[model samples]
Target: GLTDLTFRLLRESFADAVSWVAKNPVLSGVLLTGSDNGLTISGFDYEVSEAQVGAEIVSPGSVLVSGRLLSDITRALPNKPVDVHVEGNRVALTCGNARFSLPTMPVEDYPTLPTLPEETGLLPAELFAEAISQVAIAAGRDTLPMLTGIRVEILGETVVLAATDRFRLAVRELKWSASPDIEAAVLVPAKTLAEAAKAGGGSDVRLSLGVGKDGLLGISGNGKRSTTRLLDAEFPKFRQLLPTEHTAVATMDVAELIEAIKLVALVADRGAQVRMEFADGSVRLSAGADDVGRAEEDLVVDYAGEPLTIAFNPTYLTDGLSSLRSERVSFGFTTAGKPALLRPVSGDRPVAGLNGNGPFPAVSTDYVYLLMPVR
Candidate 1:
């Protein structure tokens, strides 16, 4: 039994909750359960705010609302006809204009979520947050399917990230303290871990592997934890699919390149295609879409290798160029017909493999994202 005033407050709370629930079909319905401890409401993609947890129902049993809120209550408080009166044979849930009368099921029926893994790896907060932010946005939603799962590679002192939706790709790597003895590494579901990373902020987050008895992946940091189901399918072997060597290497202003792509994207009829022609002392980016007349921009670059020409989905170039860590970078082209490999070079050290001599660092950083050409 809840008081009239209690229903008054709950009415406002439920209205807000209903509105929020309606927007996300993926998060609709609540898990309502009653136990000797108290009445608890769960099942939203997000946790209920702490401020919303205060209130008391004068009733003896707890009720869980794991479904649509509309299905849970139909009357006002105390005197309302839908009050949850757990009489031996029947149960009533009433609040304001809503009322639900049904038989109560034992709370033990709901399955439990997986517990946190016993073995896990600790990642520094700043790099972890940075890694997710760089690639999560590029992760296509349900429509693209495969891009929804993030790739996490822990190679010695480096962590590499890559994400794509068959259109644009973003790849980044960060250095971390090396430990050969680290435990399990998992390809966590992006949707849940993205939020967990945000909540942990720029602090270290701990990632545990393997599913729990509850069948959920456990992600936690900064006193917050989330359990989400892991994607069941195996991730594609992306490295093999990407290009390895190139015939041309050029560096251009990253910001200017991104801006140029955005400008061209505004008018291109089909997906934007930017063509790069290496010649003389400059690299030229040009586009000709029947919808938008044409555009051409010249960028001063260092091209010591052979010259070549190739067309690319402008967005891919924008993403790759924007994520570069060096002051200037270069692109290697095996041939106009082959995929180009973009790289960040050091101003002081001559690029190791550009000349196809000496030993190149096994990888530039702890990891390298080998991206396939945008065919």
Candidate 2:
């Protein structure tokens, strides 16, 4: 046999290391290593300790597992045992925890990777945190890969977060005061940014951006930083796509808008469509499905536009409206079929009605999530 080890040896040594640390309040954790054909386990208390358990695995090894990890794997497998193997320094925790073995590869052959930027900037962690938090719930894991990442736009006084999973869009704006030397654009993977945001939680975070001659994009925040291959494609020129000429603008309490559609959507189709019509005084939301009948709700508004009608996925509007931080949300429309824009009314009385504080300059940081109309 190329690689073989006693099942009891592994179950006892590996499991014991993690168990010992967990049982004792004094011992922090064991130094468990799984690399090449070697599995080593050691435990210490304020001083170096020799390897208490080790094996020169002709096959691969599994070490450094926590109770949480083992519990998760066990729950997923139930009666089945998980087999561990190493295919060239890459470990694969396989099926069957019993008498099974696989070939091992040396870690020496692995490629040498570049050293990331140790020099990170201490920017306001809240800048990226609030941005990702506002839009993450709206991003999708399938179909719209582009929407899986959010467009983070940094500006002088504000930062913008934008996300869309094709069907719906989420945008959030935050206030920040920073004057970077350059204009920056980057599509941060929502999964990564969300993790970064979670890793930082409500605490302050630091980030280092590497925009070198290679056009490389790097993001580091919290205690952990991540480097990713930038999406070489162009994001939708969302600015021009937004409607400038509007049929009407209506402002309604966000909570009122949500409550109005809640009951209507309950019995709506799985892929339900909601109709919103602008009339003399307010907007109406109604949902219809082949299986479920139909329901409608009237929401009062202060608007007088050339009566317009449009159908949208109610959930999309719900998500977009949820990210907004305002007593009232504003709606702008060019047509029923075209994409509609939504924003939270500015707290500033001077810039409240209009979408901007001063003038609608370039869509700066105060983020905007533009929804593509349902076909």
Candidate 3:
């Protein structure tokens, strides 16, 4: 028999396109490699961990599909043993009432080649998910696939997730419990990344991966798992987009500004920019169009600068502000034409230090949202 497996070996539960609950350079397919020593069942997002621990697939050469690889095969099969056969150009399977036939995306692509993989460390699921939202909400679609994905930079203990849409970019960093000497710049589909973060990652999530040009990331915790194929797009250069210096920085109550913008933007032309003028003690927000009624609002802000005016897409401003998840939000301006940096603030202002200040540096290092003003 070319490829043979019992029904139970292919039954598993995983959710979402994940983009990658167990991301990898490989795919969302089940891998069943058998040969010399024996068949080694390995995968991300349950690539291959169980050989029917709950059933009768404890055979010496049985290969299990992790990533719920074979879940679709035996999906609705009766409580009977499954028989999987790798055929000429098709995979044939049957358990009871149904017969399944699928094109072998593999017959040969299956073993074009392979080797080398393992786990790296652990991270908090709750924290990971929060960080994902803080940035994912800022993701948007564009003709270039690069604009719609999250660029996940894994720098040993520090992990950064960023996404952009030309007009706005959101970057958030979190920590991984690893002393590993590994680094990877993974550009993953935003939907997959967000789905992976939401479905699994309960409390303590296990971080696993096989480091190669074919990088695979796996997040398993709280009993849920995910995997995704990294997006194949070179995320355009954006580091320079975030200002390192602010000619003027404005600090204000986040909710206060968020509420004011909603009312003021009501009068702006559809998709028009909301104008904000900032100074030492007050920032005025206003919007108006030829036929639309005009509106304006003012809020007391703790800021000091040359007093500048910047116009921004109302939705972009509100989105950036809402994601702050803090008591106060700091808007760092370099100029009216340049991008503005927004950071979450709770107490005194933050300055980046040797290790980003403290803990996750939720105040300083966690997120940096760069928003381009409407010129």
Candidate 4:
């Protein structure tokens, strides 16, 4: 019933929508509704730009076509405008030298998408993507479904995101502009939320809360809008799990350490430990066991305490370090048997105290990565 031109951004939006749908049932197909105003592509993200975004809408109508099919064709098309027209039983997409006649399904069979919630707050795309990825890295991929989700808690001015898989935990707190006195929390699937943040272009990501019926969470921004069902009640109690104090702290170049770990971990299983013995001005990292090749390397570190040896899963260590957006990383330790905290150094000084006693505020801050020793 309608024909319009799709901008490049809109074409990507189509691809994103396709990612949210499964290849089963009927949702595998997308609902394309365009009018004289603009094209409205609603699936997971229930809204689209209504302004005439270069689409010469001749009439008004809607169509349901294979999402996977459309995405593959749309993405491979040249960097030219996409002219789409829905007629009789076919949806025609005309590009440079590439004319595709795709059969359309009845739009009436498309499932109803949840009503989008009103705006709850605004988060910059950069911050949202960075913060979400950092914490989601530690999200569990396990039996309990909740642990695979990240807890997003809104506390007045600061929003905290945290995830854990028993062996490791990552927490990131960021400032956001929220509704007056608004404080709410939800556990969202890590993978879905990460994809949502990644899709948000360089603009304000408008966060919306309280979707209809199932109480879904919604985010719309920079021409991309999406919603996902929330997981069950609150996430794990991770506050106390963060160390209140550490006996020692160490700081070193993040990139260098990661490279060293990668090299030394070659002889060991990913889940095996690459032990680090820390003291004075340097630390030694070693990995391997009986009858196998062993490797060790010493790295310069700024340690202001007694020598301590700790072991960590090589893969986990690399993951925690890789997600850090810093040149130097700090490690807070109480004992070789306890979990150590990791964070980026803002300056030469580490967050935790050098001494193994007294009141130095916990190695706490806007972000922290707690890693369990492989004891």
Best by TM-score, which number? 4
Quantify all predictions' global Cα lDDT against the true fold. 0.52, 0.55, 0.65, 0.73
The segments of candidate 2 whose C-alpha lies over 4 angstroms from its true place after superposition are: 1-114, 118-122, 154-159, 172-180, 201-203, 210-223, 243-245, 289-291, 348-365
- Give candidate 4 misplaced runs (Cα > 4 Å): 1-25, 44-54, 210-214, 269-271, 350-364
Q: Model 4: which ten-residue window has the lowest total lDDT?
A: 45-54
Candidate 1 lDDT over 13-58, as tens digits, reads: 4443333322223233344333443334444343321112223445
Report how far off residue 215 is in candidate 2 (Å): 7.0
The C-alpha RMSD in Å for every predicted model, in order, reads 7.4, 10.7, 7.6, 3.8
Task: Tell me the TM-score of each prediction against the true structure.
Answer: 0.64, 0.62, 0.67, 0.87
Off by over 4 Å in 1: 1-111, 137-146, 154-160, 166-186, 210-216, 241-245, 289-292, 325-327, 344-363, 366-374
| Top-lDDT candidate index | 4
The pairs that clash in candidate 4 are none
Model 2's number of clashes is 4
In Å, residue 80's CA in model 3 sits off its true spot by 21
Pick by TM-score: 1 or 2, better one:
1
lDDT of 4 at 36: 60
Evaluation by lDDT, superior candidate among 1 and 2: 2
lDDT of 4 by residue, 1-375 (tens): 134322223455444444444221355677766556566665533332211232455665667778778768877877666677665788777776778899876677777776557777887899999899899899988768868888888867789999988889999999998756766888888878877776654888877773222356777775555667788755778767666666777889999999999999988865488999998889999988767788999999987666788889988888888877889888887766678888877756643344443434454468888899987
Q: What tens digits encode model 2's per-residue C-alpha lDDT throughout 201-262?
A: 34455443424322333444322323444445444455565644455666688998888777
